[PDB]
Design a protein around this ligand. Sequence first.
Ligand SMILES: CO[C@@H]1[C@H](O)[C@@H](COP(=O)(O)OP(=O)(O)OP(=O)(O)OC[C@H]2O[C@@H](n3c[n+](C)c4c(=O)[nH]c(N)nc43)[C@H](O)[C@@H]2O)O[C@H]1n1cnc2c(N(C)C)ncnc21
Length: 181
Amino acid sequence: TAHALKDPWFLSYIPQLTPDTVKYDFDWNKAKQALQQPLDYIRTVEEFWSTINSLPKLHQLGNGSTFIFARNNVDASYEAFPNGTRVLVDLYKASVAEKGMDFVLSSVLGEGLTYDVFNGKKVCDVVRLSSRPNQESPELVRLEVWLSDQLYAKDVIPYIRKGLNEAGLSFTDFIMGESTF
Ligand SMILES: CO[C@@H]1[C@H](O)[C@@H](COP(=O)(O)OP(=O)(O)OP(=O)(O)OC[C@H]2O[C@@H](n3c[n+](C)c4c(=O)[nH]c(N)nc43)[C@H](O)[C@@H]2O)O[C@H]1n1cnc2c(N(C)C)ncnc21
């Protein structure tokens, strides 16, 4: 009937997930346990597209509101990925952030990164998408591409930036970054 992804990805939502909100939650395990909401289990390309299209625009939700796409329903914990890293993308307008999200998700879930960068290795298991507004940029959206190995971030950063340029985004439309685990 429909076309299976290489792996199903579980989609969850953590509302207004901020560092000073885990102040209300003293521990990470219990903050997630209580706040995370399950949204869907993407098995196919058809399921993928309807989910991506149905997603309520990140900036509209509260500051810190994250969407987690976790390969084979893995726990998106830094703890789970010790030799890893997370490639960051900040998108200044909500308009560009749609095009950007569509690229980064199609590259991850569609195994684009896997066969274009990792030579077959499934290095990416988590993609987080959250609202991170500034007094400066209030429509700001952040994408995190989680890696199992930091050796690859050196190659994920030019690949994602090149893809985003091809997707229509200028250099003022986004900023690439990294955060070690
Ligand atoms: C370049 O890299 C910079 C830093 O290295 C990295 C630190 O991440 P956070 O503290 O945001 O944290 P995180 O990305 O996890 O945010 P979020 O998940 O939404 O909520 C944070 C809270 O959630 C907790 N948390 C969240 N997660 C996902 C976990 C997890 O897996 N394990 C554990 N133990 N805790 C987790 C965390 O401890 C904290 O209390 O963020 C980059 N950064 C740079 N500028 C900014 C900026 N500006 C200018 C406004 N705002 C935000 N991040 C910025």
